[PDB]
TrEMBL record, chain A:
Signal peptide: none annotated. GO terms for cellular component: plasma membrane. This is CoB--CoM heterodisulfide reductase subunit C. [4Fe-4S] cluster 2 binds at C53, C87, C90, C93. NCBIfam families: CoB_CoM_SS_C. [4Fe-4S] cluster 1 binds at C43, C46, C49, C97.
TrEMBL record, chain C:
This is Formylmethanofuran dehydrogenase, subunit F. The chain holds residues 2 to 78 of 388 of the full protein. It comes from the Archaea. It comes from Methanospirillum hungatei JF-1 (strain ATCC 27890 / DSM 864 / NBRC 100397 / JF-1). [4Fe-4S] cluster 2 binds at C46, C77. Residues 27-56 form the 4Fe-4S ferredoxin-type domain. [4Fe-4S] cluster 1 binds at C36, C39, C42.
Automatic annotation (TrEMBL), chain D:
Pathway: Cofactor metabolism; coenzyme M-coenzyme B heterodisulfide reduction; coenzyme B and coenzyme M from coenzyme M-coenzyme B heterodisulfide: step 1/1. GO terms for molecular function: 4 iron, 4 sulfur cluster binding; CoB--CoM heterodisulfide reductase activity. This is CoB--CoM heterodisulfide reductase subunit B. Residues 4-84, 151-243 form the Cysteine-rich domain. Belongs to the HdrB family. Keywords: 4Fe-4S, Iron, Iron-sulfur, Metal-binding, Methanogenesis, Oxidoreductase. It comes from the Archaea. Pfam families: CCG. The keyword Oxidoreductase applies. Its cofactor is [4Fe-4S] cluster. The lineage of its organism: Archaea, Methanobacteriati, Methanobacteriota, Stenosarchaea group, Methanomicrobia. InterPro entries: CoB/CoM_hetero-S_Rdtase_bsu (IPR017678), Cys_rich_dom (IPR004017), HdrB/HdrD_reductase (IPR051278). Coiled coil: none annotated.
Automatic annotation (TrEMBL), chain E:
It comes from the Archaea. Disulfide bonds join C192-C195. Pathway: Cofactor metabolism; coenzyme M-coenzyme B heterodisulfide reduction; coenzyme B and coenzyme M from coenzyme M-coenzyme B heterodisulfide: step 1/1. This is CoB--CoM heterodisulfide reductase iron-sulfur subunit A. InterPro entries: 4Fe4S_Fe-S-bd, 4Fe4S_Fe_S_CS, FAD/NAD-bd_sf, HdrA-like. [4Fe-4S] cluster 5 binds at C594, C597, C600, C637. [4Fe-4S] cluster 6 binds at C604, C627, C630, C633. Belongs to the HdrA family. Its cofactor is FAD; [4Fe-4S] cluster. GO terms for molecular function: 4 iron, 4 sulfur cluster binding; metal ion binding; oxidoreductase activity. [4Fe-4S] cluster 2 binds at C255, C258, C261, C312. The keyword Iron-sulfur applies.
Length: 189, 79, 77, 296, 662, 137, 252, 95
């Protein structure tokens, strides 16, 4: 932690673990507050959220730690953490927080910022592709069409699987935010 | 002053809950009828209980014992 | 609040058991619904006006299940 | 006969069509009329799509809402995740003006406006309400007792939580869904940590399948210990997790449970006399045949 | 009239926002103004000397001071005006600091100067029309009332009585003592609570200057600082004290506390003193150390079987037909000491308080651990009666909580009493371990930090994490406590045999009704409000009423007793003098303008107005003692027949006219 | 050439305390309102308001305690009824009734007092000079 | 005189003995009464908080809570001084409202806001944006040129060491009995507590009177307290001292 | 963390991270107290030790965490930690 040596393994081993005031990103905090629509700066680290999380007992995921990073503005610590995608959004933390914070909403805002900086698992991008193509995250297939027919339902549900003219409107909605143009670019690699 | 509930889904309009209720039978079958109000009347094929505010029933069970395909549940506990 | 005056009213088979828990002291007013006859000589006599009378004919004929001949407010007893 | 637009998201029509078929039939048997939604799509699934972009989540949920707005009807749902998306975006855009404005100028590119005129209901919520079909009406409609079956309920998370954002009451130990299973004649059993997430929410099902399956396996262990013969659920996500994930648990781990997973609408159909073939119970990974032997 | 205008700088607090020279020159050119002048600190002795010299030299009729707020410095400048040969009430202030300078500091100077000139003009216009008032002095009845028989009420009553004032001690329950009588041991010294309090209970019971009235409530209060006509409800105790028995004619006596009545009573009900854990008959005492050992009868649960009277025999202490008697008592001052109750923690469903057997709260734990409680002092599990070996303490249970269910404040003593209970279990059950799930241990008082050190030394485990939820094991009835160890950085699952919730405290039941009877307001927190939060924590805004104890906010027994003696001193101040001066803001009816319509009579909350006969004409009559100076009646009367003494219509209208003068 | 003339009549026990608290906390607001300070708002007679408006108040503000928080148990209910009736009279004599309002400011709401000051100033500035000053002639 | 009331108050514990916080050796390290005089509008400055080293306005201010308190090493005091968490919150608010854009860092170890409206005050300070770092300060280093202070501790909740560089460091020092208080209480015959404060007759039920009759305690001299508690204690002592004077007799 | 699967990589990935009362070794704590001759059970986790450590800013070594493990009896967590040998015994924490 003396300085930068430019030997990557030694830089990884002797990374400065010490928090400085140069590490705080108030812009990151303000973006999180705006997007999450929650009073996240009011956490006093009681640990109820982590005590209620179902992901915590089997991983290194700590929602209280993510709340602390949000409060201190530790962008590039929160966003690059691979345990940002282990939240099931079960809302137990939000159900129990004594300060009326929505830590899962803070997690959602963090995930949006991570996507905007191009950190995102591939299942999310594949779901974007599927919804762009057919409007359905879990689309129909031939075997289910046969099963529906044997039941007595129409071979396709009344959705955009049977009314393909609304797919164009869905595609314009997605294209307005450029979600497809980012998902395909990130997938290409 | 109890509460009776009629399962409209399996009521056939048999009218044996109307004929057998001893509060319905007060008007025409009593000397000097006292009260002429009626718990049930079969409107549109199912038994309707006019006794909305649960003032006339006496938990007799003549109507529960009468319906051929059990469809009248008698509640003996305060509504 | 406070919990230990635990008032419970359980229908154990054919006996309606009305209870008041403490740590070590209980109180069990037990009504045997096979012997009750639907008279009110238990409601007229109650000094504390808790016992009320229910669907006597239905219960005594077997056509009522969710009630006994008499209801006792075990919080007032 | 109350009439509702039937949203019908992705998993029920495309993986478990018996769920939607029984939904329509049983809802019609009780006093409810479920009308098809015209060109509805994926409710932008709250985890896998809300994690990516909240603004497009809002826009797609609002489009789904304005379809039924033009229909002039109240949405009825059968999925907790779809409930989250549809109902919560409806609630947020009924009160937040700048978000209304943003969504409206996004939707104006497709000649379509959100005004906030309808309400969103879960089908089990309707079955429980007293104005609409109540527990007593469900008991009346039941024609096959389904007696002598131990059935474990999974509430899910997006229907009831957070309780500061919903209106279903206590989240620590609710009993309302246990009353609907008791109406059918099956005895609902209680298991340890019954309010635990199934593990499939938030996109974890896709991102880390082993993590999600461990969360699911904790539940399956508790349910087997209680002694359940089936798991009722009110969510096609949770049904997919409890159904596929039993197979993936059998292969990735060495655990065998063979516990059938059924939607409450499928159990209601079984109670009201629908056939297993008409419910398409052959489309589940886990065979329902032991449960059918018990309740038939 | 001749008015002097004195403009304070407040040491640049005002001169740094306006032009004091310009304000002074404008005051000089104003009409009626004899002298206008300025000084750096008009509230200081040279400032009062300046006022007095100006009065003497210029023969001033009235004084206007352009300075800070009247609510801060009316008494100062009224006394300065008196010393100088004027009436105190020929004085008027113009608030040009807290309403001109501090709010128009930045970038706007001539605007603040114009505002100051306007305020000075309005003040001069009012003061040119003020005239002489003399404050009303009213006699003070030499008795006092203390509502509440807890430690704070008993301390206040003993203090007043030993100062010599006759005192009434009203307690709703059949015994004095309060919560401290329920406590088993006390932090931070570990003394037995009853042992330290019984001496003081005996003093209260024996004091000749204390009229101890237990099992009695306050129906209604009317009056003021002078005489409070307090009506008391003497609830039907059902049993006669020896004095009352002799008065009624029974020579053999009344109740001697033998216990035969409760030995034969067949009714059995929960004991509220033991938080419901223990049985008590229909005729009963809370505990064996109650101060009036007189054996109340619980008429809501008595069946009038008459066995108790046969057991009592010739003593004839039991009167089963007794009814609520009403008494009216005149008192000079009143002290409110209503205490507190535990917040209902069953609303927090994640901690299964009512739904799991082995989850209790801290007063039930204190009764279970006391040697006089339902158990023989042996802590046992409610579920099966077995001795626990692991006990958890959930601190902050319902406190510092902004979700709308719990309380947003700290209850002050719950960290300390949880430490006491951890010590008690670790010393009473050998090998038992105490786990405290805490979020800011708050040991702030004298010897509290040392107590905390000693508890950690004896070996309590301190886990810094607020409990998330509690699950009950289906078979052993053990409780699985789930939280995170925030310092360790991992989730935890601690399985305990007994869980104790350190619940928040809230104002007692009926306390809001009583404080509305007495005219006291409430705080943001919901506790009774004090006159000034810093420099007057005992008195209230309504004169003659004082606060003592937890009723004003949660506190330990030391702080409660200090507050109680402070309140007793404040209540003794006017009784020892015997006079008290009221503020001469009363309504005065001008009879040869009153038409006798009687419509104003119903506009007085204090019933100070009535219709009476004067010179044949029916006119309105003001009870000047009962009037409080609000002005509702005088703002109503269409004919202008009611005059408000320092805020008369001509004065207020002169202020309005001066504002619009240009 | 024109500056609004707004007059406030604030009770001693909550509105004067709130204004004092705002000053102590150093909350800035424009210097357009001048206050009178009566004991309760029950003291405020209708003729005070009407006299202000006929002398030429571009606006009038009456500030008192919240309902249930009057120092004198119920003196602001009387004031509220009186000001409702004053709103009706000004509307029917054809003067703009939004020149008058009654706010309930507690003793601890210095921020709310500042916001009330700002909003009253803004509303009167939008409304413009009162018509009485030219209708008199 | 008939009775006597002792109200000698308190002084700040000498915090220059704790050498790791360079109180006397670094210019820009002050204590809480010096900060209160610097922030008062009647103080040496015009109410403007400026750095002692160069007279420039600080933009980052650190508050070392527990400075010399709850300390069993023999240098500091083993007790809590009661009001230092509250006054540090007040000072953080004052700097954040008086210097625009200034940030307050509180290095704390158990925030103790126990009194009436104290928790709400704590909530409001956090809302206005004071940073609360749960870690007792380990040591303080002074930058040789800018005279800035490098505060070294661990963020115990975050789980990492920290190095916060502030322009001004304020020590919330412990309080101790005033100078000469022991001499005066020996003149009057009063004993001392374990803590070193004057002792009361009964710690629970008589916090004002002493064992020597006719002498009563009031204020911080009996133990640290806020102005509300001090005034309640003072009036209690006045009442106790009036009890024998009003009677005029007293029995030995 | 559901149970033991006996697939070593999955056991490593889903190791139970949750502290139980079965994890405490009071014998380990008593041995530490005896050998160290210090009052280690009296730590209240102020963080001064870690704030003064020269090894902490460049590694995962946390002396306060080791003190917490000692207090809670986490044998096999303290002993097997490879950052047990990064203490230079500079005695700043003790100071
Ligand atoms: C579990 C627990 C443990 C505690 N342990 C300690 C400890 O170890 N040490 C310590 O110092 N403090 C302790 N405390 C705090 C202590 O109990 C209080 O400081 C103290 O009891 C305050 O007494 P009080 O007289 O103000 O109120 P209370 O003791 O509540 O007395 C109020 C009295 O007024 C009566 N009353 C109420 N309303 C009316 C009415 N309308 N009319 C007439 N009478 C009325 C009540 O019946 C009661 O008798 C503990 C508190 C709890 C909850
Ligand atoms: S529960 Fe709320 S207050 Fe507690 S640590 Fe989590 S976010 Fe912070
Ligand atoms: S919402 Fe996410 S962080 Fe909160 S408890 Fe559920 S999984 Fe944990
Ligand atoms: S129970 Fe008897 S009285 Fe009541 S409705 Fe039936 S037949 Fe009539
Ligand atoms: S007897 Fe039964 S079936 Fe016939 S009308 Fe009555 S309820 Fe219906
Ligand atoms: S009704 Fe009452 S009195 Fe009659 S038999 Fe039953 S219990 Fe006895
Ligand atoms: S009278 Fe008021 S304005 Fe003048 S110096 Fe004193 S405090 Fe300041
Ligand atoms: S028997 Fe009579 S004297 Fe004895 S305790 Fe009972 S009431 Fe009192
Ligand atoms: S009358 Fe009977 S019930 Fe009442 S107290 Fe006496 S013995 Fe008990
Ligand atoms: S005193 Fe302690 S336990 Fe009680 S509310 Fe305050 S911090 Fe929590
Ligand atoms: S003072 Fe006025 S309101 Fe009162 S009676 Fe006389 S005329 Fe009527
Ligand atoms: S001013 Fe009038 S209404 Fe108010 S208290 Fe006095 S007499 Fe009553
Ligand atoms: S009051 Fe706060 S800062 Fe002062 S010694 Fe106690 S805990 Fe430390
Ligand atoms: S061992 Fe470390 S964390 Fe524990 S008290 Fe000492 S310095 Fe603080
Ligand atoms: S001795 Fe030195 S290196 Fe070892 S823990 Fe202490 S400060 Fe760190
Ligand atoms: S005291 Fe302010 S409105 Fe009455």
């Amino acid at each position: 932690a003396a300085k930068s040596y430019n030997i990557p393994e030694l830089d990884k081993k002797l990374a400065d673990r010490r928090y400085h005031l140069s590490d705080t990103n108030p812009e990151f905090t303000q973006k999180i507050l705006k997007t999450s629509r929650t009073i996240a700066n009011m956490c006093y680290q009681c640990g109820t959220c982590t005590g209620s999380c179902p992901s915590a007992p089997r991983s290194s995921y700590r929602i209280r730690l993510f709340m602390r990073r949000c409060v201190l503005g530790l962008e590039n610590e929160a966003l690059t953490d691979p345990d940002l995608w282990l939240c099931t959004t079960c809302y137990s933390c939000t159900d129990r927080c004594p300060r009326d914070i929505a830590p899962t909403d803070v997690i959602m805002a963090m995930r949006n910022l991570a996507f905007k900086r191009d950190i995102v698992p591939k299942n999310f991008l594949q779901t974007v592709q599927l919804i762009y193509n057919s409007g359905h995250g879990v689309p129909n297939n031939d075997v289910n069409r046969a099963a529906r027919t044997k039941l007595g339902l129409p071979a396709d549900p009344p959705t955009t699987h049977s009314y393909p003219e609304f797919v164009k409107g869905i595609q314009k909605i997605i294209d307005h935010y450029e979600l497809k143009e980012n998902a395909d670019r990130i997938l290409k690699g | 002053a109890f509460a009776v509930h009629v399962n409209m889904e399996r009521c056939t309009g048999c009218n044996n809950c109307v004929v057998a209720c001893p509060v319905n039978a007060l008007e025409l079958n009593t000397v000097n009828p006292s009260s002429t109000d009626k718990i049930y009347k079969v409107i549109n094929g199912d038994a309707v209980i006019l006794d909305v505010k649960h003032e006339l029933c006496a938990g007799c069970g003549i109507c529960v014992d009468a319906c051929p395909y059990d469809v009248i549940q008698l509640s003996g506990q305060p509504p | 609040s406070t919990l230990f005056p635990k008032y419970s009213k359980t229908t154990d088979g054919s006996k309606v058991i009305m209870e008041q828990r403490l740590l070590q002291q209980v109180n069990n007013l037990i009504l045997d619904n096979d012997i009750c006859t639907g008279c009110g000589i238990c409601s007229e006599v109650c000094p504390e006006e808790a016992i009320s009378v229910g669907a006597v004919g239905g219960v005594r004929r077997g056509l009522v299940d969710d009630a006994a001949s008499i209801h006792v407010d075990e919080t007032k007893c | 006969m109350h009439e509702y637009a039937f949203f019908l998201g992705c998993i029920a029509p495309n993986r478990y069509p018996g769920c939607e078929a029984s939904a329509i039939k049983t809802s019609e048997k009780v006093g409810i009329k479920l009308l098809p939604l015209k060109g509805a799509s994926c409710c932008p699934a709250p985890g896998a799509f809300g994690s990516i972009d909240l603004n497009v989540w809002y826009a797609m949920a609002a489009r789904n809402l304005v379809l039924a707005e033009e229909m002039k009807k109240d949405i009825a749902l059968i999925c907790n995740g779809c409930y989250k998306s549809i109902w919560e975006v409806n609630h947020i855009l009924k009160h937040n003006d700048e978000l209304r404005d943003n969504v409206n100028e996004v939707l104006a590119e497709i000649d379509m406006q959100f005004k906030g005129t309808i309400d969103v209901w879960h089908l089990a919520e309707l079955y429980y309400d007293d104005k609409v079909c109540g527990v007593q009406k469900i008991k009346d409609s039941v024609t096959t007792p389904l007696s002598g079956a131990k059935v474990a309920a999974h509430y899910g998370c997006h229907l009831m939580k957070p309780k500061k954002e919903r209106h279903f009451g206590d989240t620590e130990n609710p009993m309302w869904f246990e009353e609907l299973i008791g109406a059918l004649g099956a005895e609902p059993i209680q298991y340890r940590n019954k309010m635990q997430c199934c593990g499939a929410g938030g996109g974890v099902r896709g991102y880390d399948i082993v993590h999600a399956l461990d969360i699911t396996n904790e539940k399956l262990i508790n349910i087997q210990e209680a002694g359940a013969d089936a798991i009722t659920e009110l969510c096609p996500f949770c049904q997919l997790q409890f159904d596929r994930g039993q197979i993936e648990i059998k292969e990735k781990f060495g655990d065998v449970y063979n516990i059938p997973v059924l939607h409450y609408n499928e159990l209601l159909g079984l109670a009201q006399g629908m056939s297993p073939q008409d419910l398409a119970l052959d489309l589940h990974a886990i065979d329902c045949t032991p449960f059918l032997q018990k309740v038939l | 009239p001749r008015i002097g205008v004195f403009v304070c700088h407040c040491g640049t607090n005002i001169a740094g926002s306006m032009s004091i020279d310009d304000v002074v020159n404008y005051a000089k050119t104003l009409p009626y103004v004899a002298v206008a002048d300025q000084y750096q600190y008009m509230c200081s002795t040279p400032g009062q000397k300046k006022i007095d010299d100006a009065i003497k030299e210029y023969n001033l009729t009235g004084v206007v001071v352009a300075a800070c707020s009247p609510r801060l410095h009316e008494p100062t400048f009224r006394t300065a005006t008196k010393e100088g040969g004027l009436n105190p009430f020929r004085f008027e202030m113009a608030n040009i600091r807290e309403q001109n300078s501090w709010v128009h500091m930045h970038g706007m100077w001539d605007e603040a100067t114009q505002k100051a000139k306007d305020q000075v003009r309005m003040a001069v216009a009012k003061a040119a029309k003020l005239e002489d008032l003399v404050p009303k002095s009213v006699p003070v009845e030499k008795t006092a009332m203390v509502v509440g028989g807890g430690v704070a009420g008993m301390q206040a009553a003993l203090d007043l009585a030993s100062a010599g004032i006759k005192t009434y001690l009203i307690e709703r329950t059949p015994t004095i003592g309060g919560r401290m009588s329920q406590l088993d041991k006390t932090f931070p010294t570990l003394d037995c609570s009853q042992c330290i309090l019984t001496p003081k209970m005996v003093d209260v019971g024996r004091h000749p200057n204390i009229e101890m009235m237990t099992y009695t409530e306050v129906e209604k209060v009317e009056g003021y600082i002078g005489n409070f006509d307090v009506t008391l409800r003497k609830k039907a105790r059902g049993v006669l004290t020896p004095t009352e028995a002799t008065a009624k004619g029974i020579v053999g006596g009344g109740c001697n506390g033998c216990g035969d009545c409760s030995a034969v009573c067949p009714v059995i009900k929960p004991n509220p003193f033991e938080m419901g854990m223990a049985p008590r008959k229909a005729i009963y005492i809370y505990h064996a150390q109650v101060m009036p050992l007189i054996y109340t009868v619980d008429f809501d649960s008595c069946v009038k079987c008459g066995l108790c009277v046969e057991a009592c025999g010739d003593k004839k202490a039991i009167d089963l037909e007794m009814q609520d008697e009403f008494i009216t008592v005149k008192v000079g001052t009143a002290v409110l000491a209503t205490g507190y109750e535990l917040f209902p923690i069953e609303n927090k469903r994640e901690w299964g308080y009512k739904q799991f057997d082995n989850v209790i709260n801290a007063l039930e734990f204190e009764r279970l651990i006391c040697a006089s409680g339902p158990t023989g002092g042996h802590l046992v599990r409610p579920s099966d009666g077995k001795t626990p070996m692991k006990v958890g303490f959930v601190l902050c249970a319902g406190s510092r909580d902004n979700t709308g269910i719990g309380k947003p404040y700290c209850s002050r003593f719950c960290c300390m009493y949880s430490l006491k209970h951890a010590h008690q279990i670790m010393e009473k059950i050998p090998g038992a371990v105490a786990y405290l799930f805490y979020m800011d241990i708050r040991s702030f008082g004298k010897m509290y930090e040392e107590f905390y050190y000693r508890i950690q030394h004896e070996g309590a485990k301190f886990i810094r994490g607020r409990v998330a939820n509690v699950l009950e094991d289906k078979e052993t009835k053990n409780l699985h406590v789930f939280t995170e160890d925030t310092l360790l950085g991992r989730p935890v699952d601690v399985e305990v045999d007994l869980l104790v919730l350190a619940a928040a405290v809230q104002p007692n039941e009926g306390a809001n009704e009583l404080r509305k009877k007495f005219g006291v307001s409430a705080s943001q927190d919901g506790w009774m409000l004090e006159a000034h939060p810093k420099l007057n924590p005992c008195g209230t805004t309504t004169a003659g009423v004082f606060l003592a104890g937890v009723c004003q906010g949660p506190k330990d027994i030391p702080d409660t007793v200090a507050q109680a003696e402070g309140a007793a001193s404040a209540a003794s101040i006017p009784i020892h003098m015997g006079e008290v001066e009221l503020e001469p803001y009363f309504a005065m009816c001008i009879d040869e303008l009153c038409a006798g319509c009687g419509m104003c009579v119903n506009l007085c909350p204090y019933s100070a107005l009535s219709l009476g006969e004067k010179n044949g004409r029916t006119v309105m009559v003001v009870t000047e003692a009962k009037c409080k100076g609000c002005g509702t009646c005088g703002g109503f009367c269409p004919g202008g027949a009611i005059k408000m003494q320092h805020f008369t219509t001509p004065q207020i209208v002169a202020q309005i006219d001066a504002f619009f003068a240009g | 050439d024109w500056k609004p003339q707004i007059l406030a009549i604030i009770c001693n026990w909550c509105s004067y305390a709130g204004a004092d608290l705002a000053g102590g906390a150093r909350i800035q607001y424009p210097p357009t309102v001048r206050a009178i300070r009566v004991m309760c708002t029950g003291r405020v007679d209708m003729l005070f308001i009407l006299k202000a408006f006929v002398e030429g108040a571009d606006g009038v503000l009456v500030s008192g305690c919240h309902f249930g928080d009057c120092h004198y148990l119920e003196g602001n209910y009387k004031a509220a009824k009186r000001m409702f009736m004053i709103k009706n009279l000004l509307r029917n004599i054809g003067l703009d009734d939004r020149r008058f309002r009654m706010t309930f400011v507690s003793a601890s709401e210095g921020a709310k007092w500042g916001m009330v000051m700002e909003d009253v100033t803004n509303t009167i500035k939008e409304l413009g000079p009162s018509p009485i000053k030219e209708f008199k002639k």
